[PDB]
């Protein structure tokens, strides 16, 4: 796939993703906060299209993500991120995708997700998160 | 003076400032790094003209500021930043302005300057620095 | 279980834990680094005995943990941490304890684990980790 790395920002205003209920997560784009103004992240798109788009608009700055969870597993012979769920201090968003394979979860007790990196081919292959106070 | 606050970034690529050898620092602008891209800060302008511009172009990322120092003191009955000097791991830029009044210095043993805020009227009235690892 | 919270330190020198493959992780104790010296954390003991002890003595500071993983699962009616594994930049320590149930994993691309907190009854109920640069 194509690797991406947004780097680190001040916080998160919105997450746009797409998914298919038969396959896995497709596209991923974040609107970050950068010093109290929106910063529109790069749109990391799958090599294919036809996914269902989802927009998670956070009530920034008071609403912030406290857990990212999901599932990894096989789609057409490749290990990919099949499902994502975002839980904030106020609401849960998801699951989006297919909730099977191996679960993972990052709960945060103190600090913030301030950036994402990863790789997307036909589907989201993998991803990492930047954390800061 | 007019307040400004650039916020915090990933590092510093270039500082563009102006000064007068009989008064103090005038205009101040910074090109930061933001996750590997130049971020062109707003140019914070003096209310008056007649300054000499200087462009401090750092060899980012191997070159970085290790100490900011200067003087504060009276001009036209206002306490202002009369001079600045930027010392990096490679060389010293300045002093710019007038080296008179009360010295200050911020030497850094570990960490990086990642942002400036302050206020400029006829001259740079005051400033602060965001620091990060 | 009894809650514990060691707080944050400069690094990790040794992890002492115990486990039983029939059940889960029991005792947990860490020797932290505190500014270059060993800090002997309080020993957080299971309310019961019968566990196999493990000491993970790291080559601090050359060696540091890059991934913590494990399993949670039900033991006698309680959700507990059944298994732990510690991967460093040198070697992998574990798995300790029964590798069955719901997996979790925290790989670290950049940064350090610098503290633990959690709760232990008969078994380790849950834990969290302090992270820093």
């Amino acid at each position: 796939g194509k690797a991406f790395d947004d780097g680190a920002f001040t916080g998160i205003r919105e997450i746009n993703l797409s998914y298919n209920k038969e396959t896995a997560i497709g596209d991923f784009q974040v609107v970050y906060d950068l010093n109290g103004s929106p910063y529109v992240g790069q749109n990391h798109k799958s090599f294919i299209t036809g996914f269902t788009p989802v927009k998670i608009s956070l009530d920034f700055p008071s609403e912030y993500i406290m857990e990212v969870s999901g599932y990894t597993g096989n789609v057409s012979g490749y290990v990919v991120v099949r499902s994502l769920t975002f839980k904030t201090n106020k609401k849960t968003y998801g699951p989006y995708g297919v909730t099977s394979g191996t679960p993972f979860n990052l709960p945060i007790e103190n600090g913030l997700i301030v950036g994402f990196k990863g790789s997307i081919g036909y589907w989201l292959d993998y991803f990492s998160m930047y954390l800061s106070l | 003076g007019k307040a400004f606050d650039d916020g915090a970034f990933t590092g510093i690529r270039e500082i563009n400032l102006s000064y007068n050898k009989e008064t103090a620092i005038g205009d101040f602008q910074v090109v930061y790094d933001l996750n590997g891209s130049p971020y062109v800060g707003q140019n914070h302008k003096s209310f008056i003209t007649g300054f000499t511009p200087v462009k401090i172009s750092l060899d980012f990322p191997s070159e970085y500021i290790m100490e900011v120092s200067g003087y504060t003191g009276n001009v036209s009955g206002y306490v202002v930043v009369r001079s600045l000097t930027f010392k990096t791991n490679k060389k010293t830029y300045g002093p710019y302005g007038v080296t008179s009044g009360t010295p200050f210095n911020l030497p850094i043993e570990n960490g990086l300057i990642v942002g400036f805020k302050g206020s400029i009227g006829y001259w740079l009235d005051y400033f602060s620095m965001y620091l990060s690892l | 279980g009894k809650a514990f919270d060691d707080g944050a330190f400069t690094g990790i020198r040794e992890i002492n834990l115990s486990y039983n493959k029939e059940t889960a992780i029991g005792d947990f104790q860490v020797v932290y680094d505190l500014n270059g010296s060993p800090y002997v954390g309080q020993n957080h003991k299971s309310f019961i005995t019968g566990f196999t002890p493990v000491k993970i003595s790291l080559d601090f500071p050359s060696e540091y943990i890059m991934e913590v993983s494990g399993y949670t699962g039900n033991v006698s009616g309680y959700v507990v941490v059944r298994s732990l594994t510690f991967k460093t930049n040198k070697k992998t320590y574990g798995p300790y304890g029964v590798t069955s149930g719901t997996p979790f994993n925290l790989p670290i691309e950049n940064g350090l684990i610098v503290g633990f907190k959690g709760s232990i009854g008969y078994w380790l109920d849950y834990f969290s980790m302090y992270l820093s640069l």
Partner: peptide, 16 residues
């Protein structure tokens, strides 16, 4: 050092 600020990064989850 270098002139690039760093941040804690956790992951990756998924392939590879």
């Amino acid at each position: 050092q270098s002139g690039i600020s760093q941040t804690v990064i956790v992951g990756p989850w998924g392939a590879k």
